[PDB]
Amino acid sequence: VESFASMLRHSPLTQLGPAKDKLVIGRIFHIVEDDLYIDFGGKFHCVCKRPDVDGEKYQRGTRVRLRLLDLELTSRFLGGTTDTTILEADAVLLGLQEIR
Amino acid sequence: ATPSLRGRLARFANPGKPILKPNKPLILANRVGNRRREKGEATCITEMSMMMACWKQNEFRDEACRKEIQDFFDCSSRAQEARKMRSIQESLGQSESLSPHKMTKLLQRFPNKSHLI
Amino acid sequence: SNEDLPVPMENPYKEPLKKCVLCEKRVDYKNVQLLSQFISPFTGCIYGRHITGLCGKKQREITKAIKRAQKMGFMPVTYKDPAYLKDPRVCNIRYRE
Amino acid sequence: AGSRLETVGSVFSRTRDLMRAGVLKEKPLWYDIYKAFPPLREPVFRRPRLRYGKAKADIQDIFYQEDQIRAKFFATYGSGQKAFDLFNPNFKSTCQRFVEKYTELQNLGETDEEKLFVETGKALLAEGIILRRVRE
Amino acid sequence: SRFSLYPPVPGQESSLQWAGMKFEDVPIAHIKATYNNTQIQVVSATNASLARASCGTEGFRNAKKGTGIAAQTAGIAAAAKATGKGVTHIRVVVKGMGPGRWSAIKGLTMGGLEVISITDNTPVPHXGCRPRKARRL
Amino acid sequence: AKHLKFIARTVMVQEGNVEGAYRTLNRILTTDGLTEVISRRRYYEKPCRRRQRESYETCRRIYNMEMARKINFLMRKNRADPWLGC
Amino acid sequence: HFLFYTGKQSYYSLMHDVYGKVMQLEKHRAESRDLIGSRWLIKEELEEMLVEKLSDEDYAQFIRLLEKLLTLPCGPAEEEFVQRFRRSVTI
RNA sequence: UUGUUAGGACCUAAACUCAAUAACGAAAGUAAUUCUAGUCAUUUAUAAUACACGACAGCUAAGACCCAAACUGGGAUUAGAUACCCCACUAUGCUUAGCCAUAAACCUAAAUAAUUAAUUAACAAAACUAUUUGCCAGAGAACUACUAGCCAUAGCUUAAAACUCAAAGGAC
Ligand code: FES
Ligand SMILES: [K+]
Ligand SMILES: [Mg+2]
Ligand SMILES: [Mg+2]
Numbered sequence: 001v002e003s004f005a006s007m008l009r010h011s012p013l014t015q016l017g018p019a020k021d022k023l024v025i026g027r028i029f030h031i032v033e034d035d036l037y038i039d040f041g042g043k044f045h046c047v048c049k050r051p052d053v054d055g056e057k058y059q060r061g062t063r064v065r066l067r068l069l070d071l072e073l074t075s076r077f078l079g080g081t082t083d084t085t086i087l088e089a090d091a092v093l094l095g096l097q098e099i100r
Numbered sequence: 101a102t103p104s105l106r107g108r109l110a111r112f113a114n115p116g117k118p119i120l121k122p123n124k125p126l127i128l129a130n131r132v133g134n135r136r137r138e139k140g141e142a143t144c145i146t147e148m149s150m151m152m153a154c155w156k157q158n159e160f161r162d163e164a165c166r167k168e169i170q171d172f173f174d175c176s177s178r179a180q181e182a183r184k185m186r187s188i189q190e191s192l193g194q195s196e197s198l199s200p201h202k203m204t205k206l207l208q209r210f211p212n213k214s215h216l217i
Numbered sequence: 218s219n220e221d222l223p224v225p226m227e228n229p230y231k232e233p234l235k236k237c238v239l240c241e242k243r244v245d246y247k248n249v250q251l252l253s254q255f256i257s258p259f260t261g262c263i264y265g266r267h268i269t270g271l272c273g274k275k276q277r278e279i280t281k282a283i284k285r286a287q288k289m290g291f292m293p294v295t296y297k298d299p300a301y302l303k304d305p306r307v308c309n310i311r312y313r314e
Numbered sequence: 315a316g317s318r319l320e321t322v323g324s325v326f327s328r329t330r331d332l333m334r335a336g337v338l339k340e341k342p343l344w345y346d347i348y349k350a351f352p353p354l355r356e357p358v359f360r361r362p363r364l365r366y367g368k369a370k371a372d373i374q375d376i377f378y379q380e381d382q383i384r385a386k387f388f389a390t391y392g393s394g395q396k397a398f399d400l401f402n403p404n405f406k407s408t409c410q411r412f413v414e415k416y417t418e419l420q421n422l423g424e425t426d427e428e429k430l431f432v433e434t435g436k437a438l439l440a441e442g443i444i445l446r447r448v449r450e
Numbered sequence: 451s452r453f454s455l456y457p458p459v460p461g462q463e464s465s466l467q468w469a470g471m472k473f474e475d476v477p478i479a480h481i482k483a484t485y486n487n488t489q490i491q492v493v494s495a496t497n498a499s500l501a502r503a504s505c506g507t508e509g510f511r512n513a514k515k516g517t518g519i520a521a522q523t524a525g526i527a528a529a530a531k532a533t534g535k536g537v538t539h540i541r542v543v544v545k546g547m548g549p550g551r552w553s554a555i556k557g558l559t560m561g562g563l564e565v566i567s568i569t570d571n572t573p574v575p576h577x578g579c580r581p582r583k584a585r586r587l
Numbered sequence: 588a589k590h591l592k593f594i595a596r597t598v599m600v601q602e603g604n605v606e607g608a609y610r611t612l613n614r615i616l617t618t619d620g621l622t623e624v625i626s627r628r629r630y631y632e633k634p635c636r637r638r639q640r641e642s643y644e645t646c647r648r649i650y651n652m653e654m655a656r657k658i659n660f661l662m663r664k665n666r667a668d669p670w671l672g673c
Numbered sequence: 674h675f676l677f678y679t680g681k682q683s684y685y686s687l688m689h690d691v692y693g694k695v696m697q698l699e700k701h702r703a704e705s706r707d708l709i710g711s712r713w714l715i716k717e718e719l720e721e722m723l724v725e726k727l728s729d730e731d732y733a734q735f736i737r738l739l740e741k742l743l744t745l746p747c748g749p750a751e752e753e754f755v756q757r758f759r760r761s762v763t764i
Numbered sequence: 765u766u767g768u769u770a771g772g773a774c775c776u777a778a779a780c781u782c783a784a785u786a787a788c789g790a791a792a793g794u795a796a797u798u799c800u801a802g803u804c805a806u807u808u809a810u811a812a813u814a815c816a817c818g819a820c821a822g823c824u825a826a827g828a829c830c831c832a833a834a835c836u837g838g839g840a841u842u843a844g845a846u847a848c849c850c851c852a853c854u855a856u857g858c859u860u861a862g863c864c865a866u867a868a869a870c871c872u873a874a875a876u877a878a879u880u881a882a883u884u885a886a887c888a889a890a891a892c893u894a895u896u897u898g899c900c901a902g903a904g905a906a907c908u909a910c911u912a913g914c915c916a917u918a919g920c921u922u923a924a925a926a927c928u929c930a931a932a933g934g935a936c
């Protein structure tokens with residue numbers, strides 16, 4: 001049985017390295033009006049806006065392309081003892097993935 | 101970039117004399133202040149002066165200043181609708197930004213904690 | 218024990234530190250063209266480090282050079298020389314709306 | 315009648331005490347289960363405190379040896395134009411193939427990092443992968 | 451191919467002329483706007499007096515002498531004397547930060563003078579004379 | 588006094604928008620801090636009072652600027668409720 | 674009832690059903706005015722159906738969830754469901 | 765008198781912006797420019813009856829004087845107004861020597877070396893160990909009386925008792 005240490009070393013997330021300005025594939029699982037909730041394989045989903053072009057194409061289950069920025073949006077503020085987190089990830093929707 | 105707060109307050113770490121002496125603790129509150137009311141500016145002030153200017157020459161006789169009197173009504177008639185239309189729509193929409201009440205409720209969904217959980 | 222355990226080391230991906238627009242350059246009082254890029258075109262006032270974007274060290278070098286140049290008959294005090302009104306803009310500021 | 319003091323002892327110790335006291339006449343149903351299969355740590359209250367002075371945490375930064383190679387690859391070529399798929403458990407990215415080849419050459423005995431980086435680029439070029447040396 | 455807020459540079463060649471006059475030649479309107487009285491003087495580019503006015507000379511007195519409408523009247527009066535003397539374009543150097551700082555320039559516009567530029571010469575000492583003590587209220 | 592006249596604090600009127608020229612002139616003097624300087628030079632501020640004021644303004648700027656960050660940091664999470672009804 | 678410890682087992686049991694209906698309509702994918710001259714039941718009427726007491730905030734949330742159901746594509750089962758909470762206005 | 769002066773003289777006084785900076789100095793204090801002189805190694809803590817300093821105000825002699833300004837005079841306000849507001853003007857703030865040695869001289873937190881768990885009287889700027897010196901022992905009487913020292917003479921440091929009370933005080 002593979003060890004947890006081995007699993008982590010060869011994990012896709014460990015291979016990604018820093019997540020800033022990386023390209024990843026996500027999946028839309030929830031849509032509220034023109035807001036798309038996209039799972040890109042991380043801890044937290046991201047929330048993007050439906051593009052004007054090919055808006056109807058972005059339906060639930062649609063795999064898309066993204067440019068990650070943060071896996072979790074967090075920041076300590078003046079007088080805080082802990083980082084405030086919004087339980088959300090940061091990414092830029094680039095467009096649909098070609099099925100090919 | 102927020103100013104530096106290192107070596108400003110009077111503390112047992114700081115070797116030198118303090119720079120900043122805050123009246124109140126420097127901890128972000130979970131509310132925003134109530135924005136103080138803003139008032140507008142006089143509308144049709146120029147057109148009123150023109151009307152009044154003509155009267156002075158013509159002994160306050162409306163016969164001479166018939167055209168100017170109609171311009172004063174025109175500006176007031178436009179502004180009358182403008183104040184009506186803008187209060188009904190723009191103020192209700194609050195589209196551009198949040199109000200103090202709406203902002204504070206969002207600041208309370210992710211509140212600042214100066215104490216350990 | 219385990220070959221796959223992580224190895225202590227310094228961060229390989231650590232990002233480089235940002236430098237100021239005058240990092241490792243010589244600020245001279247006689248270079249009035251460069252000094253004029255950090256004053257106001259209308260009043261000639263020195264900009265603060267939240268406008269020039271300089272570090273503490275280079276901000277003080279520019280301040281000490283503008284005053285020396287202004288005091289030694291090289292630079293005007295109440296405005297920016299009209300010659301340098303066309304030079305590159307390196308200060309975050311907009312008088313016009 | 316109970317022990318609503320959750321900062322002294324634990325639910326098990328306070329339940330043990332209430333039975334010794336004489337107030338609780340019937341064992342709770344969860345009691346014997348805890349006695350036979352207790353948790354690893356006793357659930358006792360501890361007030362969180364800040365660290366002060368030179369006290370520091372004990373968390374190891376996770377850096378494998380491949381990161382030295384991966385850091386150079388991202389700085390020289392950026393992220394592979396092919397998009398990462400983090401849903402496939404066995405996904406092989408353009409960078410991970412670079413690191414697999416760089417390791418293979420290093421096993422042969424090449425000792426110069428410059429030699430291993432330009433040779434690996436040539437091998438992937440033969441494979442047909444499109445590596446763009448984007449300084450931008 | 452755009453307008454320049456910055457004034458022409460003295461000692462250079464420019465294409466900007468007003469009424470067949472260069473920038474250095476256009477007469478200057480000196481407005482001293484204080485917190486009590488707003489004075490106005492118009493001079494030729496050789497520093498020769500052409501018009502003079504102020505809220506006081508118009509006839510305002512005490513607290514009325516320091517209102518916006520009082521300076522507006524003074525500017526219109528200064529324009530009339532200057533317009534008679536042969537002045538159509540003025541360079542407005544407005545000293546002072548009082549109530550009739552803008553009103554005096556607005557009166558000059560109402561009086562038939564064409565402002566081509568606005569300078570500010572409010573005294574700003576660089577360290578100078580100790581000001582009078584703060585008033586308690 | 589020894590400098591050249593009409594270069595400093597001078598604006599040019601564009602197509603007869605004298606009010607715009609005045610409004611730009613004031614924006615310059617306010618942005619450059621001359622307005623506050625002349626305002627505070629009417630009377631004398633005592634050295635202890637000046638230091639108390641600068642400490643106050645710096646602490647306010649620090650608070651206001653940081654408060655803006657939290658507002659902008661949470662601006663994105665203000666969206667339609669995805670989990671309405673639960 | 675599995676929601677006994679909520680304190681409003683019947684209000685939350687109803688809000689559980691309507692939220693599950695909404696999810697299937699949203700996952701699975703015409704004019705919505707199938708019924709006209711009707712009103713949503715008042716809080717007093719809802720309280721009687723649930724045989725429990727509600728707050729004004731509890732009523733307001735229930736209506737918003739029911740409206741969202743109407744917005745979405747509705748099979749005849751949903752139309753019968755929302756009908757239960759629509760009272761024919763005796764204009 | 766006033767406004768303008770790309771006119772002349774003066775070099776009195778004070779140092780905008782930079783400074784959203786936080787450096788230097790034992791403290792007091794110190795930020796216009798230039799140059800000269802210049803801070804530096806005692807293991808560390810610990811000192812008076814000695815030595816050297818010490819904001820502001822004040823004193824002595826001679827100068828300076830733009831502006832500010834106790835006092836004083838005039839105007840107003842008020843029942844009165846020895847005030848708050850307005851005007852004028854002096855001691856004084858400046859320089860050269862000497863004196864005086866006091867501040868909420870307080871960052872109300874002595875200095876030094878640690879420690880951050882075995883740890884909330886309240887509030888403030890988290891708790892706490894060791895070392896050495898100084899200081900405190902209910903409030904008022906009392907920054908007083910007397911004594912001695914001092915360039916100080918309506919002064920500074922040093923500093924009681926009688927007598928009175930059953931509280932005073934701190935935080936909430
Ligand atoms: S950041 Fe290097 S000198 Fe400014
Ligand atoms: K203090
Ligand atoms: Mg306080
Ligand atoms: Mg004169």
Ligand SMILES: [Mg+2]
Nearest residue numbers: 588589769771
């Ligand atoms: Mg002169």
Ligand SMILES: [Mg+2]
Nearest residue numbers: 799800801802
């Ligand atoms: Mg030297």
Ligand SMILES: [Mg+2]
Nearest residue numbers: 837838839846
């Ligand atoms: Mg009197």
Ligand SMILES: [Mg+2]
Nearest residue numbers: 829854855856
């Ligand atoms: Mg004198």
Ligand SMILES: [Mg+2]
Nearest residue numbers: 822823856857
């Ligand atoms: Mg003296």
Ligand SMILES: [Mg+2]
Nearest residue numbers: 866867869907
């Ligand atoms: Mg003392």
Ligand SMILES: [Mg+2]
Nearest residue numbers: 792819869870
């Ligand atoms: Mg002090």
Ligand SMILES: [Mg+2]
Nearest residue numbers: 866867907920
């Ligand atoms: Mg005393």
Ligand SMILES: [Mg+2]
Nearest residue numbers: 907908919920
């Ligand atoms: Mg005494």
Ligand SMILES: [Mg+2]
Nearest residue numbers: 909910911922
């Ligand atoms: Mg004595």
